[PDB]
Symmetry: D2
């Protein structure tokens, strides 16, 4: 054979390249020199292919992989065709149960390093020295949809980090919002069943916009705080690179002296916070259901590594009851104004997997996977999670040996007396399979707890009370956090929350559920409640207008760290611009455009009405990446239209729509020279409008303005103007 | 408790209603008077709910389904909470492997009746008498995407019918185009791997628009005929009600005299043939990924029963 | 803690040691220098234990592995004890489904090597050069019984060999009799259900002595041939080392020129053929249900490696129809008088596994696993077997990646486009998961058939006929092979066959089934039917007495290769002798005894009425291996009683019974000096009798005479004399 | 979950309770019970919260654990009284 093209264009270069410049590839082929201890330890199971013969799984070379064995060339297939049966058998059993929740996820390899030793507050080995590099495997996910569902749905996102430390696997299994919907793990199946596709007909996928979800919410006010986050633009992240991560629960740090410190874990995106707007997110689920998974993979392949800063909110044990909320209540956040996040270290995701199924699908994360130096608390949600993540992998990953699946293997030593189980890989030579034993001189042996390399000993927390199935009265407060969140948002973020509730409740068929939810919103904030009510054609009663607002949280009337955009934190590196070409582009504009984008690490996609190439005024041949319909504005952060022969595209409906869609979704638009004739399609005044860059040509001034708009992410002041655009 | 509204507006009318008029409901509650032999035989495993106490799977009534058992109301959860562990255990193991192919599908119960005895050409009992009615269960599906993928993608569609005949189950497992992509079953894993999400990153979902699919097609010209059908508006049906169904293969009909007749199976949509246009189909995957599932469910709820010849 | 004894006597020496001298141990610890390519390839998964810390499966050191985490030291166990839950979870899911048949089995590692190149008749790489060593993993088994059933039952034995060749795994999955019970694989479930424990009450275990088996046999005369073999002493082998092995089916050898030769596979035991007697075998299932497993393991630990010679019955394609029986009928053997077994090579089993579950329980053998140079035939039993062995490990071993379980892995290259599946270990980096592909230049690629390293291509056998569910008329002959077997047995073998049938039929509760089996026996041989009938109180009718015997098999009225014992093939190495001690043994007799035995590789076990030590006449301290009741005569091949203070054990009932049992089971007995007082216990005449060695001392020819008797295995001439004897 | 293949082992004939059993648990391998409840969660209004919790009482009441007093630190320790 020789099916590859003689020019070698079928294989992507093994060097960092921008989105769309090369075909994507398995991580070890794309970036073979990106290494970490975990990735290196996976080399025993990595399989190549070039120059090898095609074989059965038993190693028999296959001569004809195109036909079944039959009696005569038009005869019946013979039972003795073991090659065919092995191949079909393996195919017939490829799928494993998807995760109960968070089935849809995207993962990458990376590393973490602390900024300083935290030995004064924790004996966790991975936080003991800034030179200790811990390999990580991170999986970002949605919650509700199946593995085949869409990425840009409105949902909570999961953010799970597996740290392969020298003293054990530590999984920090968090979400992108600082609280959860419910307080006690006993109600997880209830909440999850309510949000998931309804049982009769299994609709809807990846959406909380249906009766059972809002039925549950309306009857369980503890849910409103996370519901507020989900309804805000936090529910629709621009990318996994631009969202926050939280462990949610209060855990404990344990130092060498044995002092316990309460801690809440945070991940701060170094690319900043950014979200889409609902119409863009929903339409993007149809135009590219794999948008976040693709964005993550391509960012890594381009060298735009996803970077996060691990942060700790630290609370002394004696401060346990000093807030007006319970620290163990997972529906309550700890405002950063009250307890600041201490910056602890940084995690860089720099390599995609080789095989999605083997490494991402089969990865198993569990919050119970902690190491000496960390400990749990009585948070009743966390407590019940401890049982679930070990239990669920017995069916999902087929047995109790799921830690032998390559991606799950610890990189540190593991030895115990556990034996057998389905697909047992490890062959134990210990004469003994029990302890205490004399026949192997009691090895492997227990290790007393100690400052470093000691065995795990639980913090000796005092437990006093009767065996009861009872919620703590301290958790019975449901509206003050939701109010705090609401008052901390900008006016446009508030507007998007009202629109989120309004859209979702409009899809709830039983009107009484909508009314009951509006009543709950009246206990949070009257303006919010009235705005949503008016969109549902509902009138607040007399009594609802007089509900006294909940108290502020420890004197706070707001906390800007809860808003996505209140405090500027934009980063344009890794963003993308759509450039709309014409058949005789003013080469001077493209040169200036592309040079400036490349200096800020902003990528570009050259679009036209057909594939192939167009030739600029000076003769520069410009390769087209996609058509206007092929790569809609939903996929880019901004749109630039260079001058040239505008008449080529002035009547192109698709070109005009590209600008109207981007305009509607608050994206920066820049128009050079005769490209200013497109101002009429988006009805911009002669004197311009903030958010629209316009100039005789695309010089350096035009590009700085556009890049300034991109750092601000979206043009929020345009909101009142999109109402009148048919798009 | 007093949770349902006093006006009873939480319960959908148990009579045929047009799309959007009432919340949808489980079939036996929505249309209690519809029956067939198969639906009646499922009655022994149907479980109600109204007026029963909430129990464990072992039949123990539960007093508090809102909390775990802990040592103190702010204490650690106890290992002896068997009610919590059973409930979470069941939850933890709810998923089963999805189908390798055709994972995305929507189904409904129905019935079949032949127009005339076909005993001159086949001894199949379900075609032996115009009065003999055979319960069916039909599942329509896409091919490539997962069970959580979108309905209005461009793909071939599966049309599988389970006939509960008096002489055994007869499954007629066809698609909505008369041919398949490949000639020999040995290449099925090759073809399916090429159309499915590429192995490094598991993209794209529910789409043949990616390199490996076209790579395979370009090297295996036998695939062109079904690709022609997929690229046409046949690949984006308006509804499962407005598409044709085919068994694809030539099978045989055997009469009582032992004579064989070659046969290709067809399903004609009595609602006619109708497809979307690509831009609409693709946008619809985003606006309502469950559109075909919903449309089938609602047609039946309205009395617009899908009919096929 | 440091629980081992300071003298290091908890650990067995890593040198060959006789049975019982040291605690047995994992193969890689007992014989670390015994290596092969497969054993070396397993090093990536072998796990040690010494000097390692006890951890969870996630690598977290455990401080206290004696207690659960509770609230108070007398309090409730807490759900947060993840260490307890991981440990109990792994325990709770240790078991996997046992094999449907052959669930009881014992295995070992070894190596094979051909005597000469067989390139003229086969292109199989493992048979191409005398210097090519192929690692093997062999599993011997019973058939009916579960994995916890007893070894010495009356049943067929399985003999499966996994050859790890350079061109793929070849599994030769055979039994210890040259035919099977049934002709078509479609009846496998019927036959197996008939022999296994009856469905209402799941009785009996490890036995065909029950109504459903004999009901089936009575209605399916094709079974009679293998039933004759099971009722003979073949059904109760002395050890897996002393039984023959057969592939049963006619397969094909294919050479480089494309010529097909029919072949039947044989394994000849280099230790010779030897079986127990029924009473001994049955009682031994009680005294030591693990006798064969133990014996295999200890033989290998002692350096008595089980050795077998692979041999081929070869039949040219032109001679397919030259016999009275069909070559494709698995109920028919090919008499060695017609087609000799040509010696092909030797297999040596020289290392036990490390972990029984991991290597033995999870091993998967399948007769469809063939390599270029071999092919199948249309034998209808073999044809259906090809479906079953791949299918069954989807549940037994949890999925289609069972070839990734360490013991099953090929040692040669394996690459293909198969992906995913539960417990997937291999991480594929191939950009493509399909062929034909251009994106990886079509690798891995198909390989044309050729003389060496070529792809597999089935032999182009002509197929002609209609699609039918029909037994070939050439298979409808059921009594001549049974008769040929019967007539080839010695007179004491025939008696044992008659006793086997009589005992088994006596456990059949429904008398008409016994009558029906007797009628079938009357179609094989009248002497046989009459003797069985007589033992069942049944009279043959005049018609039965006149049934004409079946024709000879191609002119043969007997074939001595079918007898275990007709042609002497004795081998004493690895056998064991019980030595009954007294409290003042004549040390001189003991020295002569033990050294003679050791010179022939015969083991000894010193027995007494208690454990500890006894002191000989000269002060020699004699370590006691076991008590008379603790290691019954069933477990040894011969018994020797040295002189000394015989009055010590003269009135010991166990010591007297030891000799009565050994006497009844036809084993050699040797009495020195005053030990001759025991002759009265077994009723031996003053003058002596063949089979009893006696002299004033253990000097001169005493040991040579006993070793001659051991070389003949059992004293068959004593049968008439044991008839009485209350033992 | 491994021995009997899943969480629906209570639906294996010999294991089934002969008294009523109703809850919001769904699916799992070899699910036999076909639930008609519009709701698969509680609290729910769409099925008027059925099946419902039952207060503990003298007969036919919901299960409530004896309210044993628990007092101690979180320890992996054998009681001295067991020694
Ligand atoms: C008691 C059950 C329970 C509860 C209360 C929660 N979860 Fe959970 N979650 C599970 C039961 C579970 C699970 C059934 O065990 C899952 C799905 C399958 C699996 O491996 O883990 C899981 C998956 C899962 C994932 C995906 C890990 C991956 O990518 O594989 C994340 C990120 C979280 N969860 C995060 C959360 C957060 C931060 C929670 C609340 C604070 C939460 N879970 C409460
Ligand atoms: C050799 C394997 C093979 C081949 C060549 C095909 N299929 Fe298939 N199909 C499968 C192996 C498979 C499967 C692995 O066995 C599936 C998926 C899971 C299931 O139960 O069956 C299945 C599912 C599946 C379904 C969904 C049944 C349901 O709704 O559950 C339909 C409609 C088809 N097939 C249609 C066909 C047609 C018309 C085919 C070509 C003529 C075809 N398949 C070729
Ligand atoms: C069609 C079904 C079928 C038939 C006709 C045969 N058996 Fe088989 N046997 C199986 C189906 C099977 C099996 C269900 O697939 C097993 C049990 C589990 C396993 O892995 O393979 C197996 C086990 C198995 C083993 C055990 C391998 C081990 O140690 O793991 C041996 C030695 C044999 N068989 C030998 C034979 C011989 C020589 C046969 C007749 C010539 C025969 N079997 C007929």
């Amino acid at each position: 054979d020789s099916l590859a093209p003689e020019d070698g264009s079928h294989r992507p270069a093994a060097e960092p390249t921008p989105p769309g410049a090369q075909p994507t590839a398995p991580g070890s082929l794309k970036a073979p020199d990106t290494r970490n201890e975990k990735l290196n330890s996976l080399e025993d199971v990595r399989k190549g292919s070039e120059n090898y013969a095609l074989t059965t799984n038993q190693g028999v070379r296959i001569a004809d992989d195109q036909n079944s064995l039959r009696a005569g060339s038009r005869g019946p297939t013979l039972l003795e065709d073991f090659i065919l049966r092995e191949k079909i058998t393996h195919f017939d059993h490829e799928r494993i149960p998807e995760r109960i929740v968070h089935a849809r996820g995207s993962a990458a390899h990376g590393y973490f390093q602390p900024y300083k030793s935290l030995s004064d507050i924790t004996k966790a080995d991975f936080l003991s020295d800034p030179n200790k590099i811990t390999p990580v495997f991170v999986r970002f996910s949605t919650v509700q949809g199946g593995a085949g569902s869409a990425d840009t749905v409105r949902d909570i996102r999961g953010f799970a980090t597996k740290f392969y430390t020298e003293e054990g696997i530590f999984d920090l299994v968090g979400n992108n919002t600082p609280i959860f919907f419910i307080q006690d793990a006993h109600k997880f199946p209830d909440f999850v069943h309510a949000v998931k596709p309804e049982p009769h007909w299994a609709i809807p996928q990846g959406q909380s916009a249906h009766d059972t979800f809002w039925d549950y919410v309306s009857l369980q006010p503890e849910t409103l705080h996370n519901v507020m986050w989900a309804m805000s633009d936090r529910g629709i992240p621009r990318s996994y690179r631009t969202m926050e991560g939280f462990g949610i629960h209060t855990f404990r740090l344990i130092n060498a002296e044995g002092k316990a410190t309460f801690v809440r874990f945070h991940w701060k995106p170094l690319a900043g916070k950014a979200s889409l707007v609902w119409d863009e997110a929903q339409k993007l689920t149809g135009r590219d259901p794999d948008f976040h998974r693709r964005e993550l993979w391509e960012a890594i392949e381009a060298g735009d590594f996803p970077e996060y800063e691990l942060g700790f909110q630290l609370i002394p044990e004696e401060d346990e009851f000093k807030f007006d909320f319970d620290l163990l209540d997972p529906t309550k956040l700890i405002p950063e104004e009250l307890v600041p996040v201490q910056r602890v270290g940084k995690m860089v995701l720099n390599r995609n997997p080789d095989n999605f199924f083997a490494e991402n699908e089969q990865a198993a994360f569990h919050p119970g996977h902690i190491v000496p130096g960390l400990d749990f608390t009585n948070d009743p949600l966390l407590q019940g999670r401890l049982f679930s993540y070990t239990d669920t992998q017995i069916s999902r990953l087929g047995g109790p040996n799921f830690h032998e699946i390559p991606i799950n293997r610890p990189t540190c030593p593991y030895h115990n007396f556990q034996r057998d189980g389905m697909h047992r890989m490890g062959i134990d030579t210990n004469p003994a399979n029990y302890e205490p034993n004399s026949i192997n001189d009691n090895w492997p042996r227990e290790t007393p707890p100690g400052p470093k390399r000691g065995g795990f000993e639980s913090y000796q927390e005092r437990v006093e009370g009767n065996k009861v199935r009872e919620r703590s009265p301290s958790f019975g407060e449901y509206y003050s956090h939701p109010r705090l969140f609401w008052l901390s948002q900008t006016p446009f973020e508030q507007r998007h929350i009202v629109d989120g509730f309004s859209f979702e409740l409009s899809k709830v068929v039983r009107p009484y559920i909508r009314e009951r939810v509006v009543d709950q919103l009246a206990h949070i904030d009257l303006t919010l409640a009235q705005a949503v009510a008016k969109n549902l054609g509902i009138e607040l009663t007399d009594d609802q207008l007089n509900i006294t607002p909940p108290p502020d949280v420890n004197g706070l009337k707001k906390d800007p760290s809860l808003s996505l955009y209140a405090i500027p934190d934009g980063d344009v590196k890794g963003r993308v611009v759509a450039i709309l070409l014409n058949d005789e582009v003013r080469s001077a504009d493209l040169l200036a455009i592309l040079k400036a984008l490349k200096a800020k690490g902003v990528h570009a996609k050259l679009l036209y009405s057909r594939m192939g190439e167009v030739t600029a005024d000076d003769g520069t041949v410009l390769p087209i990446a996609a058509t206007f319909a092929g790569a809609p504005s939903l996929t880019v952060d901004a749109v630039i239209v260079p001058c040239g022969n505008i008449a080529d595209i002035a009547d192109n409906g698709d070109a005009n729509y590209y600008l109207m869609e981007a305009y509607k979704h608050l994206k920066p638009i820049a128009l050079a020279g005769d490209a200013r004739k497109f101002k009429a399609t988006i009805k911009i005044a002669d004197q311009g409008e903030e958010g629209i860059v316009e100039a005789d040509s695309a010089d350096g001034s035009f590009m700085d303005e556009l890049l300034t708009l991109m750092a601000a992410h979206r043009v929020w002041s345009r909101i009142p103007k999109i109402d009148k655009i048919p798009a």
